[model samples]
Target: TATVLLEVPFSARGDRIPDAVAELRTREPIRKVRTITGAEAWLVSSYALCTQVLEDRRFSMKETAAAGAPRLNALTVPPEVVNNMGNIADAGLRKAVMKAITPKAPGLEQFLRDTANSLLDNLITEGAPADLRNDFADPLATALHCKVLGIPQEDGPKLFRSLSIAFMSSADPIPAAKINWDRDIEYMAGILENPNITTGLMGELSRLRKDPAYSHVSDELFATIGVTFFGAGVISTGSFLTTALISLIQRPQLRNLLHEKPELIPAGVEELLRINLSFADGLPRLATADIQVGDVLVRKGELVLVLLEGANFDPEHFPNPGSIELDRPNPTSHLAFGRGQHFCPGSALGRRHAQIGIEALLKKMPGVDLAVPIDQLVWRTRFQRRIPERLPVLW
Candidate 1:
């Protein structure tokens, strides 16, 4: 049979992983697929192949932004900013960046619990049929990121207002994305100069900005870190938690178990992460050298996408992949935070965000359920994250 050229991003629904992904993983684990950019790329779906690609430095995340390179989606960020972590490392800011984002920072978990409580309190006051996406998940994510960045909590909404454009996955560069990028950079520059910014990631960056040894660091880079980290963290945690809530609400038995046994919430979260349909598209990596991935030889410069769901949902690696068993022996094996050199720096914070959010939510509204039919929830398209436009729920 001639190879089928299936389109990438097999589905847009946030609440379900499409059946086609499993079919592809079994029939052709590393097969050619056409992306939104009209570029042919290898879609590695099997868990083994996905792990190999992510673990190998030869599969370069940074090269995906090279001019004229095949793209999974359009450039929402400038090419230089494509490998933001690498850029941060080159500027000697890696240690500071990593340290500032650690979830164990004094009072951080308390802050998350406090923030989650306040958001839930407001939702409760507003009564049932609340839009959780807007009222709870996004706001909690926004507030947590603002606290992490040392930016004013009041400023979060304005910065957050830029994300709808900033995170677009179009086939071509988005004009509004640039407009938002430039504006956000300008805002970050102002934040760096603001004397009141005395803690968190930005505070550390501001101190580094003044140090004699690091004086050569460009103002643009410093500002980019602020905008990029804040936006990425907020979008990721918000989207993940929103979908996770959907998963939990749909499984009342498991939900009640977690509610009754709070400590199992963390284990339940790992299972949730394993099965999350958060990333609408595959994780993109550009082959830097000729490499054999599964049955295919991916030549240098070719684009390859690791379908996270393909790996996470593969029955070969995860028996009964769709079920959320809290005591799975290999709980943390999921690629939800990805792997290798580009493993998410904000992994700890993202986990804590969901952990605390789920904890507070169950405590406040143990009876929570979907106010609208699952199909009625509108899912966002042409965006990086898989999340409902509005997650309506009642208690």
Candidate 2:
């Protein structure tokens, strides 16, 4: 039997991820599809199936390099990228990184609050009709990421701009992104060389370097982790900021509720994460053996993409899932930060940053409005990350 192939148009793809999935869900829960990069794979678009596949250890990230394994997209990095790095593959090393970030949660929370307040103060003083994407969210997110990674604040803005263009820009983005990524890796490599480094994440990494257990880890590996950490902070935080701001403006009742009860900000953040369907793409997994998910049969070595947005919005898992409820039961159950082994290590930090930033903005500017018409706003249309091109707002 021939595989069923579903094609999603490149245009009309951005910010409207949920709607796109809804269109697909109405047809089939699982279907063979060709990605934008023209790679062939299976697309899983249901709540139960997505979760089943994600949590099942039978599907391995290591299998993608095997002969005849599915190729869903451009292999940006070779399989050796993950295979050769002992830390990337080892559950223990991953645990250490997670532990390192958890203790710093309080510091992370404070940093976000201060950063948000300072930015809001400047925005208010400057008045409105400013691009929040560039003026507010971009700089704040970039600075936070840099500080955590021990990158110099002076170089943050330049690196942020370069990365944004390289990663987010749709026009001729690959070349620029590759160049910027290499430069970032090189810059991080230099930071690891300093024996006297004594602050932030890099300092921690430096300390780990002297330990006999982790002495075998290379500077390149640390650089890779630094780049990944910074990228996660910048992109995910910016996307969340854009979505949360838009949701607040569109839903005044929810906005007022949050403003009235500041303590609910943390819960509200989870609600936003759960219902906010910004990321429509699925997390790809390769089956190590035959696995039955719902009514679909995934053969060993078959590549499967788990639709995260579809799962979060599923009514079965989340009653009235479409609506944002601050008191929603097990709001964190949503896979916004993912689940199991690949669950986002930075989730807590990201959520804390978001909570502080949004709360601070509400407190500082109670009645901010979009400087441009909603229809006039430009949305990013490229790759995995989705966000607005610019959010011009006035107060």
Candidate 3:
């Protein structure tokens, strides 16, 4: 049989996950498909198989970097890059990161709300016609992350600019993103080197470095880990801000219900997480040993792409999986943040950021009207994020 070409981040026209996912799920749940980079791998789009691959110890995230391992995308990051971060085989890095970004951390919640309000204040002053993305979502996420890490706010743009390209969800030459990523590395290097800059993870790193036990840890290693910590903070979360806003404005009745019952805002955001379109595909994992995904036997040392988006949309798991369900008794069941140890450590913060930002906007600007017709909106194909390039709106 001819190989199925599953160009990743496969975009579906007119939103609501490409119908192809429905077709694939109904047919071959674990079909072999070629990645955009031209490497063949298993595309596990069914809900059950996705769960099995993610939870099973047989799949290895670090092994995917090995020679002959299937490529998820075209950007050929060196194996050391993956090995350094992936093969940690320990949770110390994740533990330190979680401590710094706690939502319950003193003033963190207020800071997010204040930042959202302050950005909206500027947008309000600029008058009705404004790009919500440039004016609000983008800046708020970057700024909030800087404040959380005790990094200067100005570096926000330069840092996010690099990630914006690095995580861009489309097929493009890697050279430009590669250059920007180098800049990202340089910026972190400068931040981590400053002896006086003792705050958040930097402070922790400084303390650990002096201890004999952690003397082997290099400043360079800390820099790379910092990159991972904040990458979770921004990129997809930033994209979610805009996408959530777009989803809310599209339905006035839904907003009215939340507006009327302010208590339900959290519930609303949880549903949005399930129905969000920012994710194009699942993280690719390599089988450490032979593993069976669905009916097919995946041989030893093979790549399995767990399509979480597919799992979220499985009608078997979710009744009426196509639409947001507010009364969802088990909203936590959704894989908006994957599963197992590698699950998105940023889940709590990401949810809080979206919930706070969206609520603040909804309360401040009632009946948020789009300056451009819904159909006229142009989604950016350059980035994997499904948010519109420009969210023009008027209160």
Top of the candidates by TM-score: 1
TM-score of 2: 0.89
What's the candidate order when arranged by decreasing TM-score? 1, 3, 2
Count of backbone collisions in candidate 2? 0
Model 3 steric clash total: 2
Q: Estimate candidate 1's RMSD in Å.
A: 1.3
Candidate with the larger lDDT of 2 and 3: 3
lDDT of 3 at 212: 80
Q: How many angstroms is residue 224 displaced in model 1 relative to the true structure, after the best TM-score fit?
A: 0.8
Local accuracy of candidate 2 as per-residue lDDT tens digits, 1-395: 88646653334333344465766665677777876656666777778777877788787766765655555544433345534324555523565566555526457667777888888888788877767778777777887877677667787876676555444423122566667778878877878887655667777777777788887777778777777677766777777777677777667787778888999988888888886655535777788888877666878778888777778877777888678887776778898887776777778777877787789877887777777777777766655566677888876
Better of 1 and 3 by TM-score: 1
* Lowest lDDT block of 10, candidate 3: 85-94
Give every collision pair in model 1.
none
- After superposition, the stretches of candidate 3 with alpha carbons farther than 4 Å from their true spots are 1-6, 12-14, 83-92, 169-173, 382-384
What's the true lDDT of residue 180 in model 2? 74
lDDT of 1 by residue, 156-275 (tens): 999998998888778887989989999999999999999999899999999999999899999999999999999999999999999999999999999999999999988999888999
True-structure lDDT of candidate 2: 0.70
Give the CA lDDT, 0 to 100, for residue 142 in model 2: 83
Worst 10 residues of 2 by lDDT: 164-173
- Provide the overall lDDT of each model, using Cα atoms, as 2-decimal numbers: 0.92, 0.70, 0.75
